[PDB]
Amino acid sequence: HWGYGKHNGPEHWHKDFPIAKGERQSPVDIDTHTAKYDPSLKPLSVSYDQATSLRILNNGHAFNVEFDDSQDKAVLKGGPLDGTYRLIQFHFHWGSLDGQGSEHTVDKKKYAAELHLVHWNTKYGDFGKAVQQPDGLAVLGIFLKVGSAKPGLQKVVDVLDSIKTKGKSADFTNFDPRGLLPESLDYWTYPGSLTTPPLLECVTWIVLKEPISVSSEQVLKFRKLNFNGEGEPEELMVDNWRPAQPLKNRQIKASFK
Ligand SMILES: *CCS(=O)(=O)c1c(F)c(F)c(S(N)(=O)=O)c(F)c1NC1CCCCCCC1
Ligand SMILES: [Zn+2]
């Protein structure tokens, strides 16, 4: 099926998913000199005090921390967004080495990894309906650089050995995603897509300028996960990122001057 291997990677996805060559594909390069400050944008509102984590899952292409989204408990509002978007999960993309891993780039710079906090527009009732809409999802993207350890990440790192292989899950309650945020919420925003099949063009992207720092040891443990299922030959889960896609007829806006 599709993946990030030698023969089923991003350059092949268009054969099953023709929207791969569409008009609003993600990720993109963020050219910092061309992004225009938009004084009409509002400050982001991140309300995660009531977030309730449930489970961590190895789904074969990343690991997901899933939240209880049966109520408005953890929501993203404001900035470019109209209405209320509810947190459903977060996951990461990372590299085989520190010089690559992110999906978005900044002046062509690649970070070691990229965190995505996925939210769905509650006016559409469920996420399945939301992904059929141009304003169905809001994904908050946060770059990871290697330096000092991120203490709020270690609980995630420590459970990864329990979900090594595709299809494994573990209980993962009481995790606070506010521990993964940088200091500043300054951001770039643009209309785009999911970065994995089915590549639906349903996302407002909000990509924070400030990266978080994680340690070498923390990211090394991401790279011990497996794409394969238990009992199959080991394929390390590394380089699960899609490269930058053409910007086409889109403008990237900055929240900051
Ligand atoms: C392949 C599913 S995933 O790992 O959960 C997943 C992913 F890898 C992604 F890269 C995106 S992204 N970058 O576009 O944000 C993503 F949204 C993923 N999962 C969502 C689940 C949330 C419900 C909406 C349905 C879209 C897939
Ligand atoms: Zn993602």
Numbering used by the authors: 4 to 125, 127 to 261
Give verbatim lines from the article.
The 20 contains cyclooctylamine substitution at the meta position, exhibiting a high affinity for purified CAIX. The crystal structures of compounds 21, 20, and 23 with CAI, CAII, and CAIX, respectively, showed covalent bond formation between the ligands and the histidine residue of the enzymes. In CAI, the ligand forms a covalent bond with His 67, while in CAII and CAIX, the bond is made with His 64 – a residue responsible for proton shuttle function in CA isoforms. The distance between the nitrogen atom of histidine and the vinyl carbon atom of the compounds was around 1.5 Å, consistent with the length of the covalent bond, and was visible with strong electron density in all three crystal structures. The tail moiety of the ligands is also coordinated by two hydrogen bonds – with Asn 62 and Gln 92 (CAII numbering) in the cases of CAII and CAIX, while in CAI, a possible hydrogen bond is formed with Gln 92 and His 64. Electron density was overall good for the whole ligand in all three crystal structures, with slightly weaker electron density observed in the hydrophobic tail region indicating higher flexibility. The hydrophobic tail part is oriented towards the active site region, which varies most between CA isozymes (the so-called ‘hot spot’ for isozyme (isoform)-selective inhibitor design Alterio et al., 2009). The covalent tag-bearing vinyl-sulfonyl warhead showed better results compared to bromoacetazolamide (>90% of compound covalently bound to bovine CAII after 10 hr at pH 7.4). The compounds 20 and 12 irreversibly bound and inhibited most of the human CA isoforms in less than 2 hr (at pH 7.0) and possibly are the first covalent CA inhibitors tested against CA isozymes, except the above-described inhibitors of CAII and CAI, with vinyl-sulfonyl reacting with the histidine residue.
